[PDB]
Design a protein around this ligand. Structure first.
Ligand SMILES: [Cl-]
Lengths: 125, 124, 123
């Protein structure tokens, strides 16, 4: 249980942070400026890449404030071996246009602990 | 032992019905009416002191999901000590009614990890 | 070790793609058609024994998510012993086709906790 290394791809990226010592996840921020109209989704870029911890995955989880405004998360499974610019799919299920500015908090990345079992085909259980 | 508090007598204590259930059932404490394409914050009138290296996920019941009732948000932080609400998204075509005492979700205590983040020049 | 059963020959063994993959790939055992703004329970014809202190999350493939396809429900409990279903929701603008054998989701074995609850008067 050592440090998770992350790379800022550009000067626009903000280091992920936990609000509080008991916060579930690390907050992710838009590196660019977007307009999402009602009934549309947009992949938002963080310009962050990280080497993910072992036996875990990163859940791109919703911030509750944005969810009460009708902003949900699409996809959001960051694999252990994924090394690219992390992106967040924001779904505007609200009634009017939602603006994403550079620096805006858009989601929380939770390091969810997972198992990698062997699968064995059987006749019955 | 996770301690919990009822804000009112209207709160139902979260239930666990079998050893192989993913978590605990959450129940509405109030009456609600959610029109099609609209979301509503359902108050459970339960607050709790959450265990270490976990978050509580407000997770969907399959039966409601199958009716087009999805879960908004739902990340209960370890140090969230307020009234637990369930954002129900009515993605069906009919008005969805929530009565006091109705099962609305399952709370799942999800084991997580809190790494230190160290910025580096490059990974690989 | 997890034991799984193919209910029909139309079922495909769940596989991980890479050693660092989060979930095991789930496939449609049948043909489906999903209208925009509608959902569909997809049958995998795979039933399995879930590990202890765990639940399977039916999680999205990010590629389908970019096309507007999302996952409904998806909590596979430890004592669920039936055909694993996948609720795909078509939140795109056009009809969605599912062909027998298509990759529809991934299953993530998510470690959980079964704590005791105790009512108190304050925290
Ligand atoms: Cl999850």
């Amino acid at each position: 249980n050592s440090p998770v290394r992350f790379v800022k791809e550009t000067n626009r990226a903000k280091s992920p942070t936990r609000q509080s010592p008991g916060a579930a996840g690390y907050d992710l921020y838009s590196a660019y400026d977007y307009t999402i109209p009602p009934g549309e989704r947009q992949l938002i870029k963080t310009d962050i890449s990280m080497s993910m911890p072992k036996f875990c995955y990163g859940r791109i989880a919703p911030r509750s404030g944005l969810s009460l405004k009708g902003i949900d998360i699409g996809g959001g499974v960051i694999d252990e071996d994924y090394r690219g610019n992390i992106g967040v799919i924001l779904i505007n299920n609200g009634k009017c246009t939602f603006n994403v500015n550079t620096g805006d908090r858009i989601a929380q990345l939770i390091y969810q602990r997972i198992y990698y079992p062997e699968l064995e085909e059987v006749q019955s259980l």
